[PDB]
């Protein structure tokens, strides 16, 4: 085995084609499927795996009741093949209500945050064994990317946030070598709140499009230099802000130096990346709720500030169908680094006051240099046929 360098150029992206689906909620009506939330996808050099934060119960269970709480002692990081639903044979790789799993070309690294909200432990498990651990430094709900980390030359980089979810918080980039934390650099730059980053390799470093839960409806970008451990940050220059809640396209703005202060009182995990001067991004259809999901390219949206010229729009999920956390993962091609994204479709409480649980499915798209068509790939699970 060899360390992943991601030195290949990012190949041309003209759109996103479906790559995988879960159907977890539909199979939950008859099968024994884990209750999961906040999933992600990470690919080892041969094949792609899906991770989730299971509530320590199945959907057709008495413990699935009131599974809406984001942090319980029983939450575990479930990991399996991309495509195989989270059945009873799933491997719980660690205890976590906030995780980040990613492969360095030799072994998996899992950052798993558990324990009390004020006093939390982040365990760094490499090659199946616990190699490191840190504690909360701000003593306020320590968390991590909730997506895949990025390892360049074996030096994985994770983004750990500690502090208020509606105020200033300390965000640190931890550089980990074979499970051992070799460096820690606090976030520096123009980003005033970094949380739940959707990191992807951009050689020779890492680029993470994070979520601003304090004031910004525009997603901050954090560039991580794995060579000299320098962290820089700004915001997205595109005027089409990809973080909901937000303002509609007519009255939205983003000057990519400060948060826009436009309905920034909350956020959702999202993603974006740069194709030349253009920016590929994904955002929910609704401006207030996490309903629907489109992906589009904004022309000159990475360089020119407040750019609103979108093109190649795709409707991943229709407006009337629930969505959730979305994220980006990179897959090594034959000669390029393809960018793929996943969308979480949340079902249950509190939006649907029919069932008592709160579970999710995942739909995974990948970028293609060829052509594609339209369509919608929602949950497809009728809440009336699901167990209460």
């Amino acid at each position, epitope marked *: 085995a060899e360390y992943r360098n991601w030195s290949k150029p990012q190949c041309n992206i003209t759109g996103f084609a479906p790559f995988s689906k879960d159907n977890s909620i539909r199979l939950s009506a008859g099968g024994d499927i884990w209750v999961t939330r906040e999933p992600y996808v990470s690919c080892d050099p041969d094949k792609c795996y899906q991770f989730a934060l299971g509530q320590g119960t199945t959907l057709n269970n008495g413990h699935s009741n009131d599974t809406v709480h984001d942090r319980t002692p029983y939450r575990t990081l479930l990991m399996n093949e991309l495509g195989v639903p989270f059945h009873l044979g799933t491997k719980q790789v660690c205890i976590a209500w906030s995780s980040s799993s990613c492969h360095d070309g030799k072994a998996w690294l899992h950052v798993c945050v558990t324990g009390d909200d004020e006093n939390a432990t982040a365990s760094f498990i490499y090659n199946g064994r616990l190699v490191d651990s840190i504690g909360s430094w701000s003593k306020k709900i320590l968390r991590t990317q909730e997506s895949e980390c990025v390892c360049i030359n074996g030096t994985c980089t994770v983004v750990m946030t500690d502090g208020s979810a509606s105020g200033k918080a300390d965000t640190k980039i931890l550089f980990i070598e074979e499970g051992k934390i070799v460096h820690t*650099s606090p976030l520096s*730059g123009s980003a005033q709140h970094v949380e739940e980053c959707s990191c992807y390799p951009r050689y*020779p470093g890492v680029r993470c499009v994070c979520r601003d839960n304090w004031k910004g409806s525009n997603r901050p970008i954090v560039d991580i*230099n794995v060579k*000299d451990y*320098s962290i*820089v*940050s700004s915001y997205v220059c595109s005027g089409l802000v990809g973080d909901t809640p937000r303002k509609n396209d007519s009255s939205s703005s983003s000057h990519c130096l400060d948060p826009n202060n436009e309905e920034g009182g909350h956020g959702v995990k999202g993603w974006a990346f740069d194709d030349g001067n253009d920016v590929w991004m994904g955002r929910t259809i609704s401006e207030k709720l996490r309903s629907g999901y489109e992906t589009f390219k904004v022309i000159e949206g990475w*360089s*020119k500030p407040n750019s609103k010229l979108q093109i190649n729009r795709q409707v991943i999920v229709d407006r009337g169908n629930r969505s959730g956390y979305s994220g980006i993962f990179s897959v090594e091609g034959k000669s390029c680094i393809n960018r793929c994204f996943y969308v979480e479709l949340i079902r249950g409480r509190k939006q649907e006051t029919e069932v008592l649980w709160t579970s999710n499915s995942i739909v995974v798209f990948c970028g293609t240099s060829g052509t594609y068509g339209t369509g919608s790939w929602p949950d497809g699970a009728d809440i009336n046929l699901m167990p209460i």
Partner: antibody
Amino acid sequence: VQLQESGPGLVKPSETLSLTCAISGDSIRNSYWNWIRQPPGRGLEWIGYISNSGSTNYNPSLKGRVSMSLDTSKNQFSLRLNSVTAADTAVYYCSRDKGGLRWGSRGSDVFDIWGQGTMVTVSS
Amino acid sequence: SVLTQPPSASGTPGQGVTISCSGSTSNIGSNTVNWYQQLPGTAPKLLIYSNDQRPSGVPDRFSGSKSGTSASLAISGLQSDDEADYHCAAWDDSLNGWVFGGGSRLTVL
């Protein structure tokens, strides 16, 4: 902010040149701090930057004879160039890189604030 | 430097001059370029960043553009106050630092 440089105008060859940059206004806890050098009648040359987080970067062309440090208590930061040669004489500016992306089509206002500079001469 | 500039670039008052920085792939070709104005005897001052943007205070007569692995700074108006050195800085990727390669002195006859 205002960056003020202070160093020995004359440095003997093969000795060590110790420059200092004092920072007013904003404290040295939130940005990267770089040193640039301009030889007389030549263009600017980047020396390296250091942040209080421990993130440091140096110019490989200097052959690792450079050392920079920060002092938040004094709100200052210093350059410790080692084994100076006759070609090391230049005007040394201290500047600030407030962050901002450095890859791709989007950059930032790096070196927005400079210092008036100090003419470090190397001779006997 | 790695960046290459003409030793000088001249133009008559009222007209406009374009100063060119030439870079490599791990250079202006893939990263942005910042244009700094250094008056004779003083510290360099930021004029252009991100190849288009202007700091608050820089006049609109200064404009920037990038063509592949090269960058151009256009100075319209061109009064006698613009006689200064112009440096182009790009974040290099093969050395993980900054490259200037400056030396372009603008004279307005």
